[PDB]
């Protein structure tokens, strides 16, 4: 049978993500009662909900079977779950397809492979170590402002959002003065279905509002990054913006400007917001588990284990979709050619078959098997930079904190996609 209506809506509708408790309960009910079923929500394509850790890996490691962008028919699958009216808007705007960015999530092999190889080396851990000092200096300046601002704040908008964005913008070689513009467009981009993040230039109540907001935000990013691409092509620098802007194909021709824009959009949004969310979720967890803060201050070598458990628990990238290019049997279910799948990375990270007491914050999981960065050739290119940023920040921050207290109501971004806290009122005790 189809998944029960209210379980399916809890996970498919952005509104279903506004509170973590009933969302994660719907996850768990599927893992325990219907681990691979089809959600048939009004206004949405039918979706296989991939709730199980083993199934996430099985799908992600077979891109010849489970495409992101629809394989040879490029843009016939939207790798980010829009509603039907939204996908219809995009096909109207683009002329019959959904490939609204040339960013990695929209690509299939072998194009995905060729484009990813532009930055693969740049993002490897050994190649990121040359940035560690500059990242640590950014952390220290952010912590200086935290300590100066006093102990009562919103740990998200008044702290956690700034460090990750300044790291990315510094790696682009883009001036600090442009950070507020990038922050605002990031909000427009991940807030397409959040009630407090509606753009002034879109009809908020239209059945395709989210898709119109996604398109409008991309057009604003294109305008900004066109100036950057042209600038770095004309005057190359030792920065990430240059690597992206000057990239050439096997024929010695520039990649089309949209491939640079796609990298720039991905790194200027998902390249910092996910970091911000994990750092804020980590502080929220330290408030609930003061003994963990004590322990990590006593043994700073525990910080990477803290990072890994915060990544598992927060899992701020909730899903990507795939399309079956052929019939495929998994967990006694018959997935048909053309069926879409919704990969639930947060659910995989609470799979009791993999994690003992999966809802418990436990930094002593060694190894911490989390799939917060996904899997397969699309596995997060920025995983090493995310682990480095979070390690460096916590190394510099945690000595300064004796206690975190949540003093007010946490608020999550209302999204089925890239979510996490937008507000965490705290009272900090400093050492």
Ligand X SMILES: Cc1cccc(Cl)c1
Contact 185, 196 (CB under 8 A): no
Residue placing its CB nearer to ligand HEM in the complex, 116 or 400? 116
Assigned token pair, 340: 């879409």
Contact set for ligand X, span 399-428 (CB under 6 A) = 418
Q: Which 31-70 residues touch ligand HEM, going by CB under 6 A? A: 60
- Which of residues 269 and 321 has its CB atom nearest to ligand X in the complex? 269
* Among ligand X, ligand HEM, none, residue 421 binds (CB under 5-8 Å by kind): none
Q: Which residues ranging from 80 to 99 are in contact with ligand HEM (CB under 6 A)?
A: none
SS3 state of residue 338: coil
Q: How far is the CB of 4 from ligand HEM (least distance, A)?
A: 27
Contacts of 172 (CB under 8 A, 6+ apart): 228, 239, 240, 241, 264, 267, 268
- Of ligand X, ligand HEM, none, which one sits near residue 69, judging by CB under 5 to 8 A according to partner kind? none
Give the nearest distance from C-beta 143 to ligand HEM in angstroms.
Answer: 19
Of residues 317, 313, 273, 274, the one with CA closest to residue 292: 313
Q: How far is the CB of 316 from ligand X (least distance, A)?
A: 8
- The binding site consists of 112, 322, 375, 378, 380
Rounded (5°) CA angle 18-20-23: 85
Decide: is 317 part of the binding site for ligand X (CB under 6 A). yes
197 in contact with ligand X (CB under 6 A):
no
Asked if residue 103 binds ligand X (CB under 6 A), the reply is yes
Distance, CA of 284 to CA of 116 (rounded, Å) = 34
Residue from 266, 304, 384, 406 that binds ligand X (CB under 6 A)? 266
Per-position x/- string for 244-283, each x denoting binding to ligand HEM as judged by CB under 6 A, each - no binding: ----------------------xx--xx--xx--x-----
Q: Which residues of 75-87 are buried (b: 16+ CB within 10 A; e: fewer)?
A: bbbbbbbbbeebb
C-alpha distances (whole Å) from 278 to each of 273, 312, 407 are 9, 9, 19
216 burial type by CB count under 10 A (0-12 exposed, 13-18 middle, 19+ buried): middle
Contact set with ligand HEM (CB under 6 A): 60, 104-105, 116, 168, 266-267, 270-271, 274-275, 278, 311, 316-317, 320, 345, 372-376, 378-382, 385-386
Contact set with ligand X (CB under 6 A): 103, 105, 266, 269-270, 317, 418
């Amino acid at each position: 049978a189809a998944i029960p209506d209210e379980i399916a809506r809890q996970i498919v509708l952005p509104e279903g993500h506004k509170d973590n408790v009933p969302l994660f309960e719907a996850y768990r009910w599927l893992r325990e009662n219907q681990p691979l079923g089809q959600a048939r929500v009004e206004g949405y394509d039918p979706l296989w909900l991939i709730t199980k850790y083993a199934d996430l890996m099985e799908v992600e490691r077979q891109p010849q079977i489970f495409a992101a962008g629809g394989g040879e028919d490029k843009g016939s699958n939207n790798p980010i779950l829009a509603n039907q009216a939204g996908d219809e808007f995009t096909r109207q705007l683009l002329g019959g397809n959904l490939r609204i960015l040339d960013a990695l999530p929209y690509l299939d092999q072998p194009e995905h492979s060729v484009v990813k190889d532009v930055a693969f080396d740049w993002f490897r851990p050994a190649n990121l170590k040359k940035w560690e000092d500059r990242i640590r200096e950014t952390a220290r300046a952010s912590i200086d402002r935290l300590l100066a601002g006093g102990p009562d704040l919103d740990a998200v908008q008044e702290f956690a959002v700034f460090f990750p964005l300044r790291v990315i913008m510094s790696l682009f070689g883009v001036p600090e003065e442009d950070e507020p513009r990038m922050m605002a467009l990031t909000q427009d981009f991940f807030g397409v279905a959040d009630p407090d993040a509606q753009r002034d230039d879109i009809e908020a109540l239209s059945p395709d509002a989210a898709a119109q907001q996604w398109a409008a935000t991309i057009a604003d990013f294109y305008a900004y990054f066109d100036v950057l691409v042209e600038s770095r092509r004309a005057e190359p620098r030792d920065d990430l913006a240059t690597l992206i802007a000057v990239a050439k194909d096997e024929n010695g021709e520039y990649f089309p400007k949209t491939f640079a824009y796609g990298w720039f959009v991905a790194i200027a949004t998902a390249g910092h917001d996910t970091t911000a969310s994990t750092l804020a979720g980590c502080l929220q967890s330290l408030a609930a588990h003061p003994e963990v803060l004590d322990r990590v201050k006593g043994d700073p070598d525990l910080i990477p284990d803290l990072v890994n458990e915060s990544l598992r628990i927060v899992s701020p990238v909730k899903h990507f979709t795939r399309v079956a290019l052929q019939d495929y049997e998994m967990r006694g279910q018959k997935i048909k050619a053309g069926d879409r799948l919704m990969l639930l990375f947060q659910s995989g990270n609470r799979d009791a078959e993999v994690f003992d007491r999966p809802d418990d914050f436990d930094i002593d999981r060694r190894p911490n098997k989390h799939i917060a960065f996904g899997y397969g050739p699309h596995m997060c290119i920025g995983q090493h930079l995310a682990k480095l940023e979070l390690k460096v920040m916590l190394q510099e921050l945690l000595p300064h904190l004796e206690r975190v207290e949540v003093s007010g109501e946490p608020k999550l971004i209302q999204t089925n996609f890239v979510g996490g806290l937008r507000k965490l009122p705290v009272h900090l005790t400093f050492s």
